Amino acid sequence: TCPFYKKIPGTGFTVDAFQYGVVEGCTAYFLTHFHSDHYAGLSKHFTFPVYCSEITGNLLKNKLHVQEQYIHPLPLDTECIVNGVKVVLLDANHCPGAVMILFYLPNGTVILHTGDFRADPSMERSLLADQKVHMLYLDTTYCSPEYTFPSQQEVIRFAINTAFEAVTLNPHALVVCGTYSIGKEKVFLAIADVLGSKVGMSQEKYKTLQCLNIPEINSLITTDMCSSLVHLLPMMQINFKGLQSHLKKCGGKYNQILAFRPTGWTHSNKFTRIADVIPQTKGNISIYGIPYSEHSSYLEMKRFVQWLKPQKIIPTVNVGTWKSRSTMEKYFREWKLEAGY
Ligand code: NI
Numbered sequence: 001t002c003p004f005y006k007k008i009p010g011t012g013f014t015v016d017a018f019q020y021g022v023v024e025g026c027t028a029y030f031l032t033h034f035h036s037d038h039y040a041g042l043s044k045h046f047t048f049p050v051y052c053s054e055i056t057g058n059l060l061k062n063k064l065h066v067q068e069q070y071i072h073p074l075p076l077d078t079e080c081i082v083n084g085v086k087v088v089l090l091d092a093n094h095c096p097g098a099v100m101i102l103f104y105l106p107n108g109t110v111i112l113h114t115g116d117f118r119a120d121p122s123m124e125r126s127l128l129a130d131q132k133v134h135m136l137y138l139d140t141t142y143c144s145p146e147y148t149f150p151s152q153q154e155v156i157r158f159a160i161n162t163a164f165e166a167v168t169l170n171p172h173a174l175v176v177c178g179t180y181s182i183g184k185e186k187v188f189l190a191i192a193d194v195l196g197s198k199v200g201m202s203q204e205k206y207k208t209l210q211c212l213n214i215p216e217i218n219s220l221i222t223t224d225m226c227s228s229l230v231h232l233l234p235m236m237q238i239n240f241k242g243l244q245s246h247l248k249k250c251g252g253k254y255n256q257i258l259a260f261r262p263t264g265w266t267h268s269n270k271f272t273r274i275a276d277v278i279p280q281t282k283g284n285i286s287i288y289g290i291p292y293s294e295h296s297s298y299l300e301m302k303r304f305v306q307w308l309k310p311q312k313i314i315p316t317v318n319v320g321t322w323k324s325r326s327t328m329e330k331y332f333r334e335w336k337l338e339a340g341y
Contacts, residue, residue: 010105032115033098034059055097058211092117095183096212113137119296119304136310141295149291150274163191173256178238192230200228262292309341
């Protein structure tokens with residue numbers, strides 16, 4: 001049974017609610033982004049209208065085989081009427097194709113559902129600027145002040161400089177980057193660009209990337225592993241055993257691996273600056289954990305909400321424990337008292 005925080009009151013709509021069977025009263029199912037926790041339940045047999053971004057709709061059709069007649073893609077930043085209700089999709093600054101959804105209820109209530117997002121000051125000059133929001137359904141993944149991490153730009157600077165130094169010292173080193181979902185593509189694309197290489201990967205991952213509308217992508221990626229000095233592997237293979245095994249397969253072309261694991265936050269963020277990050281090393285293999293986040297830091301989240309001044313907040317993440325829920329509610333009240341809304 002569908003939980004309350006996936007329902008939009010006053011509508012026939014649900015958000016990210018595909019694992020509950022047929023939802024009573026639901027006339028349109030929205031999907032914010034193509035991550036498995038959110039699409040869980042969709043397949044080629046789904047027969048209700050799905051509303052999403054163009055990029056999400058490419059992935060639904062090609063990766064999950066959802067039939068075309070049930071996929072309803074909407075442009076961003078454009079007022080659309082769905083089953084008699086005005087909606088807008090906004091870029092979420094998450095993974096490719098990820099959206100926030102603004103709903104203009106028939107009774108005058110306005111609701112913003114963030115999906116998963118990385119709040120940014122640029123959102124303060126979207127179509128959000130123009131009107132009041134009564135209810136915010138908020139991605140609270142990192143809703144506690146211990147959650148700090150650098151900008152995506154600083155993390156990419158570190159990765160580029162690290163890779164370029166290593167391969168210039170040793171032209172026989174291979175770079176490997178871990179992946180398990182869409183998102184974080186800048187990591188491997190920026191490293192391949194500095195090295196003058198295409199990124200090599202499996203057929204299944206190439207197929208996923210070809211759905212994402214990235215400009216000039218055919219210039220940047222390939223399935224011919226032999227031609228590439230940046231390879232993508234499943235995240236689970238990014239360990240000393242899995243990398244050793246991969247290096248065997250490269251036919252003596254390489255004698256060193258430098259590997260990257262983009263994570264979210266890890267506790268080593270509470271002590272170590274990005275500039276100071278060091279790898280784990282065993283012989284001719286080194287692995288860097290880099291804190292590349294596609295969710296809001298605590299401070300980014302707080303700035304967004306204090307700017308928006310919603311009347312009520314409904315968290316969508318960390319909702320299963322009383323301790324988490326009480327922590328989040330305490331920070332929402334601090335923010336409201338400090339800003340005066
Ligand atoms: Ni996500």
